[PDB]
């Protein structure tokens, strides 16, 4: 499909059993979702943005759906206000910027 | 162009005669570009990104050539990590997500 940025590029992903609406957000070298107790191991790390920088757990081979299409990877957790789709996810459902 | 995301979409802009890398972002709503001068009138705003919310100066009707496409409209300079290229002006160069 093609999305038009008239208003944010919102779609829905699916981590586990939770349905959440997540940023398809080029600027985003990573994947960021607001915080939720995923299963695994983890590590800490700082990631930066406007405002300042927050803490997050990295979890690693994540399966993630973005609009049915199948992903997997690395997934940062924290107190994000908002759950970002990454450069890391948005290549393997073949996302691209066209104009 | 059709830009992949393996790589930060930076690309070349052109802004009061100087030549800066910029990211094309779709997780930005506005424009948000690092520290420098504009001409005219500016208005103090404040914007909220990951890390919380800062101060920045918002420049209105600025003409900006972004990889050879053109677009006026508003700016706003302050510190962000990275030069972005917002929503606001991704809609007027014809700017889509697809995959
Ligand atoms: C390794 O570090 C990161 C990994 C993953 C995401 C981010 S990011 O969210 O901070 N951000 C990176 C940025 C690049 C340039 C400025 S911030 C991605 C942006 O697209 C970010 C997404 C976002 C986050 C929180 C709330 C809204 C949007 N965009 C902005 O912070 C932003 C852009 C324009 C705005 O006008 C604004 O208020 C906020 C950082």
């Known amino acids: 499909p093609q999305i038009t940025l008239w208003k944010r590029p ?16 080029t600027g985003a070298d990573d994947t960021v979702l607001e915080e939720m107790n995923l299963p695994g191991k983890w590590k ?5 943005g406007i405002g300042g920088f927050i803490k997050v757990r990295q979890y690693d081979q994540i399966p993630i759906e973005i609009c ?13 206000p908002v759950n970002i789709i ?3 996810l948005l290549t393997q459902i073949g996302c ?4």
Chains 1, 2 share one sequence.
């Open 10 to 25: 919102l779609v829905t992903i699916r981590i586990g059993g939770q349905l959440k609406e997540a940023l398809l957000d």
């Open 44 to 48: 800490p790390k700082m990631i930066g």
């Open 68 to 80: 049915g299409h199948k992903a997997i990877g690395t997934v940062l957790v924290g107190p994000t």
């Open 86 to 88: 990454g450069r890391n």
């Open 96 to 99: 691209t910027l066209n104009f």
